[PDB]
Every structure is written in C-alpha cells, then in structure tokens.
Specification:
428 residues; two-stranded antiparallel sheet; 21% helix; Nta1p; C-N_Hydrolase; protein-N-terminal glutamine amidohydrolase activity
C-alpha cells in the first residue's frame, strides 16, 4: 500500500554565541515572526534547529557549559521549543546541552509534539573534539529511531487531498554522527546513513555545527602559539573582507519561505570551499554531506557487487555499533544452526543488502539539515548552508547524482530560515 506524504518543513539557521542565550532567543522570535509574514508562508509541520542552537558550541571547560546545561524537560531550549510547538501546532527539534539526574553531560536534541510535550530526546552518538573539553558522554543507546505522528499529511495516490494521518519513522543525527567514528573508522562504513537504510528511516533530521574548510583544525597549529596567532589572522581577514565582525553575521535574516528555488548541482572544486558569498551555500560541504549518505545514492557498481557476492562477509560481519563505543557496555555470526532473522536481511553495507544490490532502490527519504553559521574563538568558521534534500531511489558521488533532490539551501554565513513543501511516498 503506497501512501503519498506532503510535509511542510521549516529550518532555522542561527549564529549563537556563548552568553547570548536571551538575545538569541529574542532573534529567534524575530525570525519566526518574519516567516509568518512572508507572502508564500504556510504553517510548518516540523521545525528543526541546529546543534546547540541557543547556547553556542565552542565550550573549553566543563565549568563553562554548566551554566547552560538543562534537563531534557527543563530550561530555555525546552521552553522555546514548547512555545513554538504550541504556536505553530508542529513538531520542534532543537539542539541543546543536556544534564541528567546522574549529573552526566550530553550533546542532545529534544523533540516536542504539537501538544507541547516531549516525545523523544536524542543524544549525540559520535563525539567531536570539542565535546571532550567538557567530558560529554556518548549516546549509550547509539543511533536511534522514533515515530512521529503527523496528522493531515498523507493520502492515497487516487485521493486529491492530504487528509490522512501518517506515522513516519524518524531518526536524528548530530554533526559528527555523519563522520566516520572518531575520524579513524573506514570511510566506506557510513555508520549513520547505513543505520537509516537498515532501519528504513523515512525522515532524517540533522542539527549541525558543521565547519567550513577554511577553519583551523591542525593539532600542531593549535598547540603552537606563534603558529596559532598567525593562523587566526588568516581568518580575521576573510571576515573583514565580507564586511562582517569576527563573530559573523547576526540579526540580518535570509528568508526563503514557500518558494521552490532548487540548489544548483555543482561539483566540488577549489573555489566552492572558500568563505565568500554569504547568501550562497557551501557546496563543498553540501557535496560532502551528500557523500556521507552514500547508501541512499544510486551507484552503478552495486550490480557487480551483488552478483559476485563481494559484501556478504561485510554485511554479516557488520555490527550495530563500533566495538569500543558506549553502546557495548550493556548490549551484545554464523553459519551455525541458527536461522537468518529478518533484521539480518535488512542489514546493508555500502547500500547493498543480502537480497538486493541497492536496498533503498524504489524508496523515498527526506533529509533535513540544520547547520549553524558564524564564527567562534576566531578559529572555527561554521559552514551554515542549512537545507532540505530528498532521496528518490530512482535508477557521481556528489550533487550531480540525480538520485538526490536538492530542494533548497540557505546561505553559508547568514542567519535565517528556509521553508519547503516536501512531497514523497512511504509504504504501509
């Protein structure tokens, strides 16, 4: 049974600085107000915020993030998402620093239903270097899926109106989650994107604090004072040329609400990575983000892989999580006498299953990326470029691949919001 779904997705792109929570929240309401006043405005069904959307990201010590940590059902970020969900009758997902009853710190993203109550709270599974500064904990449950009850969004292919309800299988990934584990794991693993293919995720939500390539990540540079001081000046000039403060743009909102302007398919070159053109998206990262969702992309060589059975040992050998992850402190292949369960036949490697060359073929999935913009510590330039994508499964490792639809993107250095009417199909 096919089921056409029309989802109205809104993405908020912010430039939060540490210590400006009230100011950021105030700017957020300013953005949302401007959105509703758009000529082509329509009420969103789901609103996504970036990673640590209100508090800032670059925390250097545990004591520095402590004044901004909250419980999953308490604090500014929760009340914000709650008020938004009650004012727009929508789902609201926002990234926030979390503290539980056991006084453990997480990099989390809470979800609030239209009734103004949280239904889920995802924690960051793969941690970035900055998380180590305040001793962030890995998600003990690893990658997770959760249902989202959408009303008046679904319809049969014969019907002329989306009057039916649909429970979409959603999944949240945060920044590093897309990257290989600790930047050490093989590139071909594609942990998060494979997880979504394995568990048949229909809606993918990604709050991000993703970086622009011009940022300083060299470890020997950061810990060499004369090298670091010389490195900071290179970034300061790039922001000064663009007529912006060192922290980046704030208060000036780029709005793409209701339009259907798609993002041009562009291959990655030496110019697409430069930090210029604030209203334009970082196509170097856009292409990279798409590449990290390889199992959703069409790849011609999958036929040769399936008939020669090259990935069978990889599929059967594939574990749920990396063996040294927090996931394997609680939970726990043959070729024996045990039968093959359905979950095994759902497992994939490089988008290939045991029964299909390309498992996702014929399916639809929606990718929503909320990435922050701006600059922190005078070393870290966030890529912004928030956007919405669609994997059609119809039969190039970048945006040139037409198995993914670029439904729109925001600027790489401007606060703002993008709304898109997303249409796709599921199966019930």
């Amino acid at each position: 049974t096919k089921l056409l779904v029309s989802l109205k997705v809104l993405v908020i792109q912010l430039n939060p600085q540490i210590g400006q929570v009230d100011q950021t929240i105030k700017r957020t309401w300013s953005i949302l107000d401007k959105v509703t006043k758009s000529a082509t405005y329509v009420k969103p069904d789901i609103i996504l915020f970036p990673e640590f959307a209100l508090t800032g990201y670059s925390f250097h010590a545990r004591k520095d993030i402590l004044p901004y940590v909250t419980k999953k059902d308490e604090g500014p970020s929760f009340e914000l998402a709650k008020s938004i969900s009650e004012k727009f009758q929508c789902y609201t997902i926002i990234g926030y620093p979390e503290e539980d009853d056991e006084q453990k710190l997480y990099n989390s993203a809470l979800v609030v239903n239209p009734q103004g109550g949280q239904i889920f709270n995802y924690r960051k599974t793969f941690l970035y270097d900055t998380e180590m500064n305040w001793d962030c904990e890995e998600n003990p449950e690893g990658f997770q899926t959760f249902p989202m009850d959408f009303s008046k969004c679904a319809k049969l292919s014969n019907e002329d109106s989306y009057n039916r309800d649909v429970t979409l299988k959603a999944s949240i990934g945060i920044c590093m989650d897309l990257s290989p584990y600790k930047f050490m794991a093989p590139f071909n693993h594609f942990e998060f994107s494979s997880f979504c293919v394995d568990n048949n995720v229909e809606l993918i939500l990604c709050p991000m604090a993703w970086l622009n390539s011009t940022s300083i990540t060299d470890k020997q540079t950061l810990h060499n004072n004369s090298l670091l001081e010389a490195a900071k000046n290179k970034i300061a000039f790039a922001l000064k040329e663009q007529g912006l403060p060192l922290a980046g743009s704030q208060g000036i909102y780029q709005l793409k609400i209701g339009d259907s302007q798609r993002t041009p398919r562009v291959p990655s070159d030496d110019s697409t990575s430069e930090y210029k053109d604030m209203d334009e998206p970082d196509m170097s990262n856009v292409n990279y983000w798409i590449l990290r969702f390889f199992p959703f992309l069409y790849f011609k060589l999958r036929i040769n892989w399936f008939k020669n059975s090259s990935l069978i040992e990889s599929i059967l050998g594939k574990t749920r999580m990396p063996l040294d992850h927090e996931y394997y402190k609680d939970g726990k292949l043959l070729d024996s006498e045990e039968v093959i369960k359905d979950t095994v036949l759902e497992k994939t490697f490089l988008g290939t299953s045991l029964g299909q060359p390309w498992k996702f073929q014929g399916k639809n999935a929606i990718l929503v990326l909320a990435n922050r913009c701006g600059t922190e510590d005078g070393t870290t330039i966030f890529a912004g470029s928030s956007g919405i994508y669609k994997f059609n499964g119809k039969k190039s490792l970048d945006s040139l691949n037409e198995s993914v639809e670029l439904l729109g993107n925001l600027g790489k250095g401007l606060e703002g919001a993008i709304l898109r009417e997303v249409q796709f199909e599921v199966f019930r």
